[PDB]
């Protein structure tokens, strides 16, 4: 299984990916991924139990969530893998990602409605069901709520951080995980969610298929981080209330630990991953 930069997919890889995603939506399976993510968004808290976000397990949790989603895609079309969006390189509204043959573009100014692409409400193929904002069409405002996506130099400044995570292991932390997640510093992953806007800015952000491509690149950056820091590893490593320690199991699956997910090569590789 090779996860490819979206910018490099062939026309029929894009076609096969879109059709598999639309089939997961048609069959009812897609929306439960949205629902699971919103439940963790609403429950993960800086002062209490936290698993999916604002905690060290943010990265293995989304790695396992994406694996579950990729496996569902492969149950529909076994050739499909999750592509990633390098938002540091493909940083404008004119990137091929946002073309009508892939994800469609930005939303119109009146209501943020996406008007083209296979996920446009007008297609009849992408109902927004799991939602908080009651409107039922995909919305985006690319670059509307924040000026720019992160740059390569900003990502490198985060990759150079040696400590995986640090007490108090939450949104206030110093350390790589929280700088990648974005609650502190120049802000990588949160800022991308805000830049897309629409459902991507909300707890039901997997309503937008770009969610997967964003998190596949966040996931790649953890891999890059490991190769930059082969001497550094997941923390904490035991006895931390409310935080998932290295060998502790993770909700909602319960049958997998951060430890099981540190090496992605047991599950997939990337098209390219710099050796250390």
């Amino acid at each position: 299984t090779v996860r490819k930069n979206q910018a490099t997919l062939t026309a029929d890889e894009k076609r096969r990916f879109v059709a598999a995603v639309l089939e997961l939506k048609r069959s009812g399976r897609y929306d439960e991924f949205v629902r699971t993510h919103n439940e963790f968004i609403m429950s993960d808290t800086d002062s209490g139990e936290r698993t999916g976000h604002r905690s060290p397990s943010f990265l293995p949790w989304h790695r396992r969530f994406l694996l579950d989603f990729e496996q569902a895609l492969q149950s529909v079309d076994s050739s499909v893998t999750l592509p990633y969006w390098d938002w540091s390189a493909d940083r404008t509204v004119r990137a091929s990602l946002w073309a009508p043959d892939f994800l469609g573009g930005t939303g119109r100014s009146t209501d943020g409605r996406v008007m083209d692409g296979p996920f446009a409400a007008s297609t009849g193929n992408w109902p927004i069901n799991v939602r908080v904002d009651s409107r039922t069409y995909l919305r985006r405002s690319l670059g509307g709520s924040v000026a720019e996506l992160p740059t390569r130099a900003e990502v490198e400044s985060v990759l150079a951080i040696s400590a995986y995570d640090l007490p108090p292991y939450n949104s206030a932390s110093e350390g790589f995980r929280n700088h990648l997640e974005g609650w502190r510093g120049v802000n990588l992953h949160n800022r991308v969610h805000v830049w897309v806007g629409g459902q991507m800015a909300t707890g039901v952000s997997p309503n937008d298929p770009v969610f997967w491509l964003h998190h596949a690149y966040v996931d790649k950056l953890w891999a890059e981080w490991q190769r930059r820091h082969p001497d550094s590893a997941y923390v904490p490593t035991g006895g931390t209330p409310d935080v998932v320690d290295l060998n502790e199991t993770m909700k909602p699956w319960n049958t997998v630990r951060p430890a099981d997910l540190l090496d992605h090569t047991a599950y997939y590789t990337f098209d390219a991953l710099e050796h250390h």
Binding site: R54, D133, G203
Partner: protein, 78 residues
């Protein structure tokens, strides 16, 4: 300590906040009577479920960011 309560009409919508599947809220917000999940960050900023990746300073700011996001639409309860 909890933030103070508030009640105002903002962009045509009634927003209310008060100290009090999702986390044990210490604070509740409502938009036209429908409750909106909001959360406090360790640094004292706030977010809501419809602006979850964008910290703002206060629960009223979060409520206002939700009305901004909704562009007139009713909220669905969580």
């Amino acid at each position: 300590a909890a933030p103070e309560s508030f009640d105002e009409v903002y962009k045509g919508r009634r927003i209310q906040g008060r100290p009090a599947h999702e986390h044990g809220g210490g604070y509740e917000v409502f938009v036209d009577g429908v409750q909106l999940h909001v959360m406090r960050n360790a640094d004292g900023s706030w977010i809501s479920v419809v602006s979850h990746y964008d910290p703002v300073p206060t629960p009223r700011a979060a409520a206002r960011a939700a009305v901004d996001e909704l562009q007139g639409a009713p909220l669905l309860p969580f």
